[PDB]
Structures are given as structure tokens and as C-alpha cells.
Amino acid sequence: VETFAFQAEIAQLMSLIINTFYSNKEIFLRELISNSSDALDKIRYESLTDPSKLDSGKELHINLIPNKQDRTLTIVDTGIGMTKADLINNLGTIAKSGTKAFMEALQAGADISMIGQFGVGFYSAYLVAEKVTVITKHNDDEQYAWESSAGGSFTVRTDTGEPMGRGTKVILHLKEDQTEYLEERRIKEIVKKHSQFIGYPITLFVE
């Protein structure tokens, strides 16, 4: 298990998301589904010039898996996945500019729901989750598990769990007062409101 410090701007953003009073928390789901859709668009585009990129799985979809027993909401996709370099360095380096722009926009009157306009929508997961675990598999790398409960650090390890084939699974370990996001009616309402035109099948698993 390797432990890393977040980029300073990202730790600041995470603290702002955790500490700001903001009732419209449901937007985290739209952000995470949008991110999955982007990863799916990426593998679909790459597979046009290299069909072998789909040898790890032809189906392009998103599954939403609430679990009342573990108090987790899992968002699974069969997108392009992420390399170890993406998890440790690349995505966080890119997120520095968007984080700075988003925090400046909030000071000027923007609200937390606008987070996706800055390329840092993933961090809205901390509106509802005390911990986030991300399992990912890219065709050019091994399967990894990234994890953070904020506090300024995250961990990365090789994942020994069940192989995924290709894609990303975001596991949200929900805060005790955010269990509404495990209810079928609530998740259906949010998907219909914010993600009705996503161009991939979204299957909401029943418990």
C-alpha cells in the first residue's frame, strides 16, 4: 500500500466540499455518471482504429449498485479505465487548474452544482461519501485500487479482488445521514432529472 499527499489545491477543494453548507448534494451522481460516460466515449473512439482494444470486453455500459448492508453506492462502467500514472499523477496534475478556477468562481457567486464546468466533478463524491474507493483496469496496465477518506492523503495498491476486465468502479462509502442515495426511488428520480440523455445503458441493480 502506497500513501500519497494530494496536490495542495485538491486537498483545499476536498475540505471546501466537506465543510460548506450546501443542501443540493444529489448532483454528485450526475458528475460520476458523466465521468463514466466520458471513459466509455474514449474506449469507443479508440476501438474504431484498434478493434483489439475491446478484447477486454465489448459491452459499453454503466451499472448503479446500491448496498444497504455495506452502506455503499457503487458506480461501475466498462470505459477505458485508468493507469497507475493517471491515479497517482496525471489526473491530479490536470485538476490543479480547474480546482483553482472553481474555487475562484465560488468566491464570485458560483455554487457547488457548477463543479463539472471546471473538470473536477469527481470530488463532489465527498458531498455524500466519508470514503471513496476506486477500482480501475486499463488495457495497458494492472488492476489498481485507489482510496481516500480525504484528510489530505490517498492510497494506491494493486487490487487482488475480482478482475474487472476493463473499466472503473467507484465505491461510495456513504455518510450515515446520506442513505437516501441507496433508495431505488431516489436514484431513479436523480438519473431521470440529470442523466436522462446519457448515451449508454444505465442499469440500476435491485437489492
Ligand SMILES: CCCCN(C)C(=O)c1[nH]nc2cc(O)c(C(=O)N(C)c3ccc(N4CCOCC4)cc3)cc12
Ligand atoms: C485520480 C483521480 C481519479 C478520479 N476519478 C475516479 C474520476 O474522476 C472518476 N469518476 N468517475 C469515473 C469513471 C471513470 O470511468 C473514470 C475513468 O476511467 N476515466 C478514464 C476518466 C478519467 C477522467 C475523467 N475526467 C472527466 C472530467 O474531466 C476530467 C477528466 C473521466 C473519466 C474516472 C472517473
